[PDB]
Design a protein around this nucleic acid. Structure first.
Ligand SMILES: [Mg+2]
Ligand SMILES: [Mg+2]
Ligand SMILES: [Mg+2]
Ligand SMILES: [Mg+2]
Ligand SMILES: [Mg+2]
Ligand SMILES: [Mg+2]
Ligand SMILES: [Mg+2]
Ligand SMILES: [Mg+2]
Ligand SMILES: [Mg+2]
Ligand SMILES: [Mg+2]
Ligand SMILES: [Zn+2]
Lengths: 99, 86, 220, 97, 135
RNA sequence: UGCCAGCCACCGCGGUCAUACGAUUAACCCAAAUUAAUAGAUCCACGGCGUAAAGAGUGUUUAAGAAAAAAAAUCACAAU
């Protein structure tokens, strides 16, 4: 039986380190007419805009590539006890699964 | 219970009092377990444990509440504001 | 009468009566991302004993403690379904709400994933009907509402003495919950796994109630 | 006996602190060009922190070095010296819209 | 009828105290199940005060010597060309390959970090992966 | 009777329907005593000082204290 510290040591998210400038492949699970809701698998879905090139082949279940900056967008404003999560992630589109 | 008419306020208070109930532990069913001193807002309440034979030296509201609980022996001293709700 | 007392008191002497320990595992939760939370500044003060640590500002929830809580929570849910109780699933979150509602439809238990009206659990006879039997247990999949406040029905169930099982994140309030499980309520694999475990718990409880009822019928 | 527990070490991924434009540099009142880059060309006013973008130490040293050059007669007051008009723009203020 | 005060105590304590007093004559089934199977923590209301002064949290940061190696890897070569896949539990990154070969190389008895980094890079190059570095 | 006559320890009542004035009936409490007045006994703070009374315009020192467990003095900028 494996201990949980061993699983944290060998999890891919621990191997990620910094959340800035990381190339992560993700999967689109919901289609809004200009908005792509992409579950890259970490914690939250990110929202991207449909690009002007090859915009027809971004559908449900499509795998894309992302460059992560913040895994969860969250900030403090004055007069707030707790931070303000947006319940999203920040990532931009590079392309879709070049194979 | 608050209402325009006194009887309506009486009925509202009677129906709302059964919703909020406490259980008060009584040592040998007559006195409280230990000496309790507290300050709630601006009211200082100090109640003291007594033996079996000398009963209920308390403010009249405390005597009524202790009679409804079942406490027959207590000492009570209240200081500061003697507001009824507090 | 006495045999009904026997069939009520029979599962209470066995810890593993419904055999739920084989339903889930630490790897099963870890593959569905239960161990992640929000940022470290979002950490509620009551989640420090339930947090294993912080990974680069992100809260990591100890799934040893989550499994230890979840075994008791699933066992309590199985027993309250065995004793023919009313079970209500509440999750005020518009990303899974159809999935909670279909989960409860397949369970045969009831769901409130819409707006909770103010005097619903408290002033039950005016809202629902002249004589209404109150719910016996509530599962909160999300203890927070859309404006990041703690849920009203948690406080109302604490007023009405209704037990609950709540999935609390790193920013939630486990103080009012009698059976909290520290976990992740945002990731869809975690939410679907929690719904699947509650589905199999309810189904196992009702089918085992049916079989022991049939055994009681063939006894006499 | 569990070697998979984390160690109480500091953060290894601390990217170093961002630096000012003149940071680990030396300011002076004799060089008119460096002092006059941080000055409005039309009026001669001194830009603040939100336009200049320095450490507070260097912002104070630039302010004192300019004012010393203003009093001692090395640089103009009412205008930027037009011989150094075409210097590269370090300030973030945009005058033409 | 019941006890509706939230801050007095747990629902278990309130129900057992009211039945002990004698106001409640119908025993709930959840009370018996609670007597069978208790929680880890009793649900008593605690007021979430805000923390002031020199007192801070007890949460420990999750760090490793492997993360110390990952810091130098991300400083020199940046992110790996293999990208990242968080859906596979057994995903082996180029970064984690560098970490493993760094461990296997320091098991040879070399203390010098420059020698460890250079021979780890050439051991990566011998396995066919590409190190673009940062220009 | 009608802010008149008048009453009260305090709040207060009497301005043509007064359980508060004067009388009558009834009732309450003391009792060879009952009220009024004046002295006493008791009663203020081991409580507070931003807004209600209270942190004295500032620093140093004498007297008087506390040193109770562990350390320190010291660096950009507009003191005079
Ligand atoms: Mg959450
Ligand atoms: Mg008058
Ligand atoms: Mg008189
Ligand atoms: Mg008259
Ligand atoms: Mg009188
Ligand atoms: Mg009279
Ligand atoms: Mg006083
Ligand atoms: Mg004053
Ligand atoms: Mg002062
Ligand atoms: Mg004065
Ligand atoms: Zn600088």
């Amino acid at each position: 039986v494996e201990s949980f510290a061993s699983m944290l040591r060998h999890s891919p998210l621990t191997q990620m380190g910094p959340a800035k400038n990381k190339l992560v492949i993700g999967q689109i699970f919901h289609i809004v007419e200009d908005d792509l809701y992409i579950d890259f698998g970490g914690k939250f879905h990110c929202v991207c805009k449909r690009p002007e090139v090859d915009g027809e082949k971004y559908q449900k279940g499509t795998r894309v590539r992302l460059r992560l900056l913040d895994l969860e967008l969250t900030s403090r404003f004055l007069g707030a006890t707790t931070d303000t999560t947006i319940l999203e992630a920040d990532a931009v589109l590079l392309g879709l699964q070049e194979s | 219970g608050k209402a325009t008419e006194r009887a309506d306020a009486f009925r509202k208070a009677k129906n709302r009092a059964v919703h909020y109930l406490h259980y008060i532990e009584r040592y040998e069913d007559h006195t409280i377990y230990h000496d309790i001193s507290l300050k709630f807002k601006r009211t200082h309440i100090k109640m003291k444990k007594q033996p079996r034979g000398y009963g209920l030296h308390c403010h009249r509201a405390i005597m009524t509440i202790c009679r409804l609980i079942g406490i027959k022996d207590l000492y009570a001293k209240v200081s500061g504001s003697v507001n009824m709700l507090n | 009468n006495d045999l009904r007392d026997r069939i009520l008191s029979e599962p209470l002497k066995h810890a593993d009566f419904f055999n739920l320990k084989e339903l889930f595992s630490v790897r099963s939760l870890f593959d569905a991302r239960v161990h992640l939370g929000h940022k470290a500044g979002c950490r509620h003060r009551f989640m420090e004993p339930y947090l294993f640590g912080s990974r680069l500002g992100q809260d990591i929830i100890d799934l040893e403690q989550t499994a230890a809580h979840l075994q008791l929570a699933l066992n309590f849910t199985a027993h309250v379904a065995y004793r023919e109780g009313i079970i209500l699933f509440v999750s005020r979150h518009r990303q899974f709400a159809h999935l909670i509602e279909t989960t409860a439809r397949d369970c045969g238990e009831y769901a409130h994933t819409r707006y909770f009206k103010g005097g619903l659990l408290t002033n039950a006879p005016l809202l629902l009907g002249p004589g209404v039997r109150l719910p016996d247990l509530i599962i909160f999949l999300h203890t927070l509402n859309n404006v990041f406040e703690p849920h009203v029905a948690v406080r109302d169930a604490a007023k009405m003495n209704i037990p609950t099982v709540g999935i609390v994140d790193t920013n939630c309030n486990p103080a009012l919950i009698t059976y909290p499980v520290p976990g992740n309520d945002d990731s869809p694999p975690a939410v679907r796994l929690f719904c699947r475990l509650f589905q199999v718990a309810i189904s196992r409880a009702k089918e085992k109630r049916r079989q022991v009822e049939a055994l009681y019928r063939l006894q006499g | 006996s569990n070697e998979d527990l984390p160690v109480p070490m500091e953060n290894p991924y601390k990217e170093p602190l961002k630096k000012c434009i003149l940071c680990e540099k030396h300011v002076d009142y004799k060089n008119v060009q460096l002092l006059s880059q941080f000055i409005s060309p039309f009026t001669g006013c001194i830009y603040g922190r939100h336009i200049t973008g320095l450490c507070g130490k260097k912002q104070k040293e630039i302010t004192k070095a300019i004012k010393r050059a203003q009093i001692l007669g090395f640089m103009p007051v009412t205008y930027k010296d037009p011989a150094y008009l075409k210097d590269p723009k370090v300030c973030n203020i945009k005058y033409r819209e | 009828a019941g006890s509706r005060l939230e801050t007095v105590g747990s629902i278990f304590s309130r129900t057992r105290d009211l039945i002990r007093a004698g106001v409640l004559k119908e025993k709930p089934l959840w009370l018996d199940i609670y007597n069978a199977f208790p929680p880890l923590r009793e649900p008593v209301f605690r007021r979430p005060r805000l923390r002031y002064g020199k007192a801070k949290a007890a949460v420990q940061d999750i760090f490793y010597h492997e993360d110390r190696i990952r810091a130098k890897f991300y400083s020199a070569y940046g992110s790996g060309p293999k990208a990242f896949d968080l859906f596979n539990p057994n995903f082996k990154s180029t970064c984690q390959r560098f970490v493993e070969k760094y461990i296997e190389l320091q098991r040879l008895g070399e203390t010098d970090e420059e020698k460890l980094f250079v021979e780890a890079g050439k051991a990566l190059l011998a396995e066919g992966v590409t190190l673009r570095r940062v220009g």
